From Swiss-Prot:
The gene is ligA. One of its GO terms (molecular function) is metal ion binding. DNA ligase that catalyzes the formation of phosphodiester linkages between 5'-phosphoryl and 3'-hydroxyl groups in double-stranded DNA using NAD as a coenzyme and as the energy source for the reaction. It is essential for DNA replication and repair of damaged DNA. Keywords: DNA damage, DNA repair, DNA replication, Ligase, Magnesium, Metal-binding, NAD, Zinc. NAD(+) binds at residues 34-38, 84-85, 114, 137, 177, 293, 317. Its EC number is 6.5.1.2. Belongs to the NAD-dependent DNA ligase family. LigA subfamily. Its cofactor is Mg(2+). It comes from Mycobacterium tuberculosis (strain CDC 1551 / Oshkosh). GO terms for biological process: DNA repair; DNA replication. The keyword Metal-binding applies. GO terms for cellular component: cytosol. This is DNA ligase A. It catalyses: NAD(+) + (deoxyribonucleotide)n-3'-hydroxyl + 5'-phospho-(deoxyribonucleotide)m = (deoxyribonucleotide)n+m + AMP + beta-nicotinamide D-nucleotide.
Amino acid sequence: QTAPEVLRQWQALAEEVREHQFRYYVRDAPIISDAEFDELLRRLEALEEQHPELRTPDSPTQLVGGAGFATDFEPVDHLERMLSLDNAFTADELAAWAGRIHAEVGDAAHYLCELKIDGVALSLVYREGRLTRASTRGDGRTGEDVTLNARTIADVPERLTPGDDYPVPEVLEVRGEVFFRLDDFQALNASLVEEGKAPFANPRNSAAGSLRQKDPAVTARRRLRMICHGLGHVEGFRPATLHQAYLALRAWGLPVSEHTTLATDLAGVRERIDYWGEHRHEVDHEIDGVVVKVDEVALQRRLGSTSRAPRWAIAYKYPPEEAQTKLLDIRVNVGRTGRITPFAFMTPVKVAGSTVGQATLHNASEIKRKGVLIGDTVVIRKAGDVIPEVLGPVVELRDGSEREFIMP
């Protein structure tokens, strides 16, 4: 089941189900007819079962959790739009985009190539250099006031270091991606295990949970990472190309990356796409693909966007590196030095194209302190890209009828 455009039937549905889930729960102000029961949830739920590989811990069709500021979160207001990205097929053309530029750019534009990571969208608001609000995505228009929780730095300053050609804008709204580092996602995943909560599945969900804490003391201890990857509303600034915006974005002391090339033309654009995907695996934190933006600010407003995504950028996206499947039995395997290795056998899954059911656990302590037990539902990363791994179990799936490991 290698999904071709099935992801386009799913990404634009699921994420279009969070919108109303925000509005309904977070606002007491729903926009469409149904509630409690939808409609799209529904044609979504049915789709996820068949084609079954689209399931994720953070899908709104196996989730419900509110809640309301403690602070965990209550509604703010994004200064500008706050929209998604159109998707380049895994795999292929594309160019339909770069030739859509034929239209009204004048094929002499300039493409910005940035790495598109996994994590929670985070818009930040800095008035006169003082960070005021910092909120989640919401429904694009308005989001959850997570300011106190993100204030707990360490990548996101309270202030903007001034002067020497980048005078702090009267108002600056940047927008970026909060994430956990791959290794010390795991170094927390076990550090707890219990003591209140449970182990997280992916760092994609780990980053969400830690952001939305009630006590900001909790989130001041977990690290979290911040990488600013675009502009929202602006007053008394705005560049002329995006980079330009990024020299400024560190002059002021905001976490930028990458790994950003530019990228004179479509040839150098596949030069990076085909470079990552091959090289995508070997980095600090998970990257779903490559996001390509036309450098010159004018051309962007000149091409314009819609209320779904901009016309001036496509998100090129590699095969998904994780999936969710049921850990049927960790049996064993034997080799040549001192130890046998607890190979975890599960039900089949299509991740990174290849269908696999043979994800690994290195050692005794490796196991256990990942919170896994025979019968559990598990998430597996194609982290090599070779031998599959296991990030964590999704505990909210109870059953209670499945238990600890042994073997002597």
